[PDB]
Amino acid sequence: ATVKTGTVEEMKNCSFNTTTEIRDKEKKEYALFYKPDIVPLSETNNTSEYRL
Amino acid sequence: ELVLGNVTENFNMWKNDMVDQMHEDIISLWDQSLKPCVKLTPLCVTLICSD
Amino acid sequence: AVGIGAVFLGFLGAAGSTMGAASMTLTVQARNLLSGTVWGIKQLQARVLAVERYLRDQQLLGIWGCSGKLICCTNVPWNSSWSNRNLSEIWDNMTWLQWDKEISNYTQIIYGLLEESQNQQEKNEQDLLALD
Amino acid sequence: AVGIGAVFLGFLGAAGSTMGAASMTLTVQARNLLSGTVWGIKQLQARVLAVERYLRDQQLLGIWGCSGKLICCTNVPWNSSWSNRNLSEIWDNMTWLQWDKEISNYTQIIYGLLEESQNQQEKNEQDLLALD
Amino acid sequence: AVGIGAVFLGFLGAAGSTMGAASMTLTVQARNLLSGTVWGIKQLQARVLAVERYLRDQQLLGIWGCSGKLICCTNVPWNSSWSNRNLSEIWDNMTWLQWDKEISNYTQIIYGLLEESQNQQEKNEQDLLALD
């Protein structure tokens, strides 16, 4: 969220594509999550990639 | 068939409850009859139209 | 208006007749108190209340005396403060619904008297049966 | 066949014995007419119908007389148009099931006679207790 | 503890009093045995059991005699093997709960005596009304 100590770094800032009302249109969107809701997505070179 | 004879009784049209039983029974039955039917969720696509 | 085949089969149909004349019809009301997805719960709840209504009445009739008799005397004297009419007004002038407007005051006083009259009578009969 | 521990506990076990000899078993039936997710609705509807079946008989016996007596007399004479048999055929030859085939005709004649027989008794007792 | 307005309205409240003293209070128990989404099934199942419990008790009382009497004598003598106490202990020293700890043994022997005692009486009465 702003790097630094585990008081701020308890928050990640994450972005993803949501499906809009229109099934064929997807929109990029963002939110903050606490580290315990998030797990590093595997199958990648230790990157910025995650899931719930 | 039963006309009550020498009785007189205080009826009311607007303070009446049985109208709300009709109203709740109507809504609860309408909403029940729709549950098994096709949701149109896949059809919220971009339509392209002309006259 | 009154006919003994149906007057209380749609309930109520004697209620204008005055209290003495109504008293010949009571059976037609008694025999009609108990006729017969979320609608399943509606009907079950409606039925089960109609049973408990009937049994709670039959239980009160049991405890005071009399056990099933439709009409009975009770050995509870009628108090002066209730005595506001000559008997002929009650039996020959008033309707049952009109009389209810009076004795709907103070009713549970009568039920307390009626219950305890039966206790003392069962105590007394028990000693007579103990001698017998 | 007959055995007062179980004959009517799975019901009906006396049905061939002839009408007189069956009269000793009635208690075994009287004690058993009330033994005891959509399946919950099937069971609740099964139970509540069995209660309403039972109470409606108790209401009828209560209205004709007799309030819980299993057997009683009634001050309705037996009409010649039903009297097609001598008493020995009834009590010593037919079964209850064989008897039903006759008096399943005209049954509501009898229930009209019985209910009014009681009304007139309760009226007549009321006058005597008024004089008492 | 004892008080006829509430003692058995939360049920049970005379249970410490000894059997002779508790006998004045029985009415308060009887008059309360029948008071009143998936939770609807839970409530209907509780009600329907409370009804069938109450009726199965009244059915037994009918069959033995007595159909509504709260207290009655029964023409079954008390066998020596149960007679293990003087009457004065039973009525003046034990509580109803402490007494139950004894005659909770073998109670069905007494029900077999009570049921059959009524049959022989109702047959005997029918032969007298057969000459009335």
Q: Give the residue among D10, D41, D4, D43 at the shortest CA–CA distance from D26.
A: D4
Q: Give the residue among C70, C73, C90, C82 at the shortest CA–CA distance from C21.
A: C90
Distance between alpha carbon D56 and the CA centroid of its chain, in Å?
Answer: 11
Mutation to test the E interface, candidates D25, D34, D74, most E Cβ within 10 Å: D34
Nearest chain E alpha carbon to D39:
E41
> E-chain residues within 8 Å CB-CB of C62?
30, 68
The alpha carbon of residue D97 is apart from the nearest alpha carbon of chain E, in Å, by 22
Look-up of token digits 């009907």: C43
- B3 to chain C, any CB pair closer than 8 A? The answer is yes
Nearest chain B alpha carbon to C11:
B2
Q: How far apart are CA C120 and CA C124, in angstroms?
A: 6
Q: Do residues E78 and E35 make contact, with C-beta atoms less than 8 angstroms apart?
A: no
Nearest chain C alpha carbon to D56:
C34
Among C residues 58-117, those touching chain B with beta carbons less than 8 Å apart: 95, 97
Number of domains present in the structure of chain D? 1
Q: How far apart are CA C39 and CA C43, in angstroms?
A: 6
Q: Is the dihedral of CA C23, D53, E50, E17 positive or negative?
A: positive
Q: How far apart are CA C93 and CA C18, in angstroms?
A: 6
The alpha carbon of residue C68 is apart from the nearest alpha carbon of chain D, in Å, by 6
Distance between alpha carbon D109 and the CA centroid of its chain, in Å?
Answer: 16
User: How many residues in total does chain E contain?
Assistant: 132
- E47 to chain D, any CB pair closer than 8 A? The answer is no
SS3 track for E46-93: HHHHHHHHHHHHHHHHHHHCCCCCCCCCCCCCCCCCCCCCCHHHHHHC
| Rounded (5°) CA angle C62-C66-C67 | 50
Q: Do residues D127 and D81 make contact, with C-beta atoms less than 8 angstroms apart?
A: no
Token duo for residue E26: 């029985």
Residue A12 forms beta bridges with which residues? A33
H helices within chain D, ranges in order? 19-22, 26-30, 38-64, 87-92, 96-103, 107-131
Q: How far apart are CA C90 and CA C88, in angstroms?
A: 5
End-to-end distance of chain B based on CA atoms, in angstroms?
A: 62
The alpha carbon of residue C104 is apart from the nearest alpha carbon of chain D, in Å, by 25
In the three-class reduction of DSSP (H, G, I as helix; E, B as strand; rest coil), residue A30 is classed as: strand
In the three-class reduction of DSSP (H, G, I as helix; E, B as strand; rest coil), residue E106 is classed as: coil
DSSP letter at E16 equals T
The alpha carbon of residue E27 is apart from the nearest alpha carbon of chain D, in Å, by 21
Q: Give the residue among E33, E25, E24, E22 at the shortest CA–CA distance from E58.
A: E33
CB under 8 Å to E33, separation ≥6 — which residues? E50, E53, E54
In the three-class reduction of DSSP (H, G, I as helix; E, B as strand; rest coil), residue D96 is classed as: helix
DSSP letter at E6 equals T
CB under 8 Å to C96, separation ≥6 — which residues? C15, C19, C22
For residue C34, which phi and psi values (nearest 5 degrees)? Answer: -145, 25
Token duo for residue E92: 């003046």
Domain that holds residue E73: 1-132
Q: Centre a 10 Å sphere on the Cβ of residue D25 and count the other Cβ atoms it contains.
A: 19
Q: How far apart are CA E57 and CA E63, in angstroms?
A: 10
CB under 8 Å to A28, separation ≥6 — which residues? A15, A16, A17, A18
Q: Give the residue among C115, C68, C70 at the shortest CA–CA distance from D55.
A: C68
Token duo for residue A4: 């630094």
CB under 8 Å to E93, separation ≥6 — which residues? E18
Note whether B45 contacts A21, CB cutoff 8 Å. Answer: no
| Rounded (5°) CA angle D122-C14-D76 | 35
Report the residue from D52, D119, D129 with minimal CB separation from C73: D129
Q: Centre a 10 Å sphere on the Cβ of residue E18 and count the other Cβ atoms it contains.
A: 18
Token duo for residue E113: 């005596």
End-to-end distance of chain A based on CA atoms, in angstroms?
A: 17
Note whether D52 contacts C47, CB cutoff 8 Å. Answer: yes
Task: Report yes or no on chains B and A touching (3+ CB pairs under 8 A).
Answer: yes
Q: Give the residue among C110, C104, C100 at the shortest CA–CA distance from C79.
A: C110
Q: How far apart are CA B19 and CA E76, in angstroms?
A: 61
E24, with CB counted inside 10 A (0-12, 13-18, 19+), is: middle
Structure's resolution in angstroms: 3.7
Distance between alpha carbon B37 and the CA centroid of its chain, in Å?
Answer: 18
